[PDB]
Symmetry: C4
Subunit: 256 residues, 4 copies
């Protein structure tokens, strides 16, 4: 188990914010957290449309974000307020997700107020600002608190690291081998889409995995001879470590 605060207000509060099975208020708090997470995801994925892109203070999009960040920060602060051991809090993982999901809103807001008002700046960089906007998407994983499915998935992926390594390794070797073969089989032809070996990598990964987008396909006979072998060998290299991961997931899931 875990220690309990065994006190007057703090123990009651921590049982409220930690165990959704306790009472009516615990279920209410949990549903509130789920609703706010969903709202924030929709806001993030919606503000990127062509229509509102155009070319702050009262915009509809800029409000909702502040409300969601307020609620996340309040929840994190209260949850940390009554926590028995600090070492466990540091060693956890959900708290890392929460703090990472709260950081970017402070950085963006913080950066604009100080610099624009009292300095001349590029932005920072086109790349730097763009990079942050992307990190803002980790709010999905806050649903790990409310579903056993994601936690089972996390444990399965942690247990099976080595097989992931093997799968990527076999894919890499196959990609290099077949890219080289099909580039050299089509150098003499003028009308070929393969300009260099680093350009056939995309074709090799899209053919081994059986997606086959349809651009860059062989035309010479020597090209087709190799494009068949790539298709055949993709299945063989892909399907080797799948049973291990499926077995791990099934055991972790049906365990209880």
């Amino acid at each position: 188990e875990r220690p309990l605060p065994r006190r007057d207000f703090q123990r009651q509060v921590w049982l409220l914010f930690e165990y959704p099975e306790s009472s009516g208020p615990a279920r209410g708090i949990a549903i509130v957290s789920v609703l706010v997470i969903l709202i924030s995801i929709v806001i993030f994925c919606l503000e990127t449309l062509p229509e509102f892109r155009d070319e702050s203070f009262s915009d509809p999009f800029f409000v909702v974000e502040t409300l969601c960040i307020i609620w996340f920060s309040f929840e994190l602060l209260v949850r940390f307020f009554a926590c028995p051991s600090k070492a466990t809090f540091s060693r956890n993982i959900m708290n890392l997700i929460d703090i990472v999901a709260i950081i970017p809103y402070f950085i963006t807001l913080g950066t604009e107020l100080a610099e624009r008002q009292g300095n001349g700046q590029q932005a920072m960089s086109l790349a730097i600002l763009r990079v942050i906007r992307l990190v803002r998407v980790f709010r999905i994983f806050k649903l790990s608190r409310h579903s056993k499915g994601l936690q089972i998935l996390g444990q399965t992926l942690k247990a099976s690291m080595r097989e992931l390594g093997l799968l990527i390794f076999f894919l890499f070797i196959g990609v290099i081998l077949f890219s080289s073969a099909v580039y050299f089989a089509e150098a003499d032809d003028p009308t070929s889409g393969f300009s260099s070996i680093p350009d056939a990598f995309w074709w090799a990964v899209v053919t081994m995995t059986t997606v086959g987008y349809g651009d860059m396909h062989p035309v010479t006979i020597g090209g087709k001879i190799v494009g068949s072998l790539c298709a055949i060998a993709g299945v063989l290299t892909i399907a080797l470590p799948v049973p291990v991961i499926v077995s791990n997931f099934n055991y972790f899931y049906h365990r209880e």
Copy 2:
């Protein structure tokens, strides 16, 4: 078992219309029902061609439908006429399929006679009438009475609801994650098909499941780096709960 009427005419009739193993007439009735269902499906799927679309009373298409509806209604009425318990009849499922397959023909016919003759109407709506035409397709499931395969499938799908939930959940998370990544990796380029994050959802679902229609594919290098990972992760998220459903079906089917 089930109670039997244990009477003079009604018991004989219900044994005729319920158990196709009894006699010659039972087999004849069953084959008649199968023929009529097939005819009705062909009529529904055939009257939609470009040729007879053009821009009622004696049309070839409008007759056959009335005959099929007559036979379905007669069969349902007779089957319900001699039924021991009403609660079982309400709690069943095949009867729901039958009544749902009979409703739309009455609504369409019923609506035209009263309104056109004595009122001015839009139709109802373009959408409303169009919506009903689609519901007319549930006549296929009336074959659940005549094949063990469909009933095995129904039981398997009922038992494995949770794994279906998990599969859709993992797909949804993967879709959002990779759509966001590949939209942000291709914002700077002018010649890109991805205008907004809600526009990359189609690409993500068509790549994770390995269909790969071939429109909307990445062009920048940063786009290709992510389009490879989507292809790899689609297999992993798809192939997790398949063994459970296959095991359920195999057990339900080979049970007897």
Copy 3:
């Protein structure tokens, strides 16, 4: 076992033409049959090129066929010459393959000599003559005499007829359902490739099985909503009876 002729010449001959494990000559005869089969297949698949198509007596293509038919007929006649029981010969299957592979050459040749010389004819029909040319391809299955793999495959396919029926049935139901849904979701749009429900069948089969050729894909949002579900449900309906057939093949193959 099987009866043996137990005689002077006929028993020796039948042991020569039936059991390739006996002696050196048996192995020589077997290799000769394999070489002739391969030659005939190459001739059939080669005479169809654009170059020799253009718009008989001494053509290179017309000779080789007569030689191969001569050898096949000689082998069949000798094999039947010393056969203990006639009922077994009729009830076999390899002999059916041999006679079916020998028939078309006689029909084509036979038809030209009598009719052209003494009558005026269309050909017979464009379709009739074309149909026969296709039947000429059953010469491949004569390799069932020389590989255990094909015979294992034949036994597996014979044992698992019912699961094949179920697979086709589920595919048919899924095809009709999703074709109807995606035709009705795209009637209002002008620029759609789906003209009628019988036209969406091709899209449904190419999407459920995850080939995805790339013509005929949805454009409206309502179309995409259904095109995702088709992709998901294809895997589910395809992957149900595969384990049974794989188990049958594995048992029949590893049995000995």
Copy 4:
């Protein structure tokens, strides 16, 4: 086990160059070999770009190759210098990979110096020189010394030769059968991409394996009827001997 030299310098040297678990220097040597292999692969795959292609002595690309070949030759020579039995050295496989990876650099260099200086030559041939450049790619397999994954893969592929034969055989039969059917179903149409049976082979292999590049697809109804059956039968013929190979790999990998 294996014999040990049991001597003063040679035994110490062979333990250094053979067992990376011994000491610090053994780990250093192993990491050096890995770094050099990776460098050489990058050089080979990088010198083929459009930019440095243009239309030796001090080029950046021509140096690095000489350094890598020097190190490979030194390592091979030292490893062979202290080897107990010659028969084992000949019967090994890693040494074959090393000598094959060292040969091409000598041939290319050797050929240019003698012939250009004292003779007039074509090159040798466009094909001959091109063929060698391709063989230069076997440097990847030198990583078999430093990963258990590749060695497990080698043992699995050696054990399962027969199932590979069966898979290719079933694919070949299916390809011929469906190519013939879909060529004859589309001869009458003018606007068809299938000019001859040898031209439909590419379509058959790309459809059976479910890649589906998207050129060459059927247009007539008779063509679509067969293009569906090809898609269905590809899964059946592909998925038969996969369980055997997966079982072999799993046993060899989880053995220890």
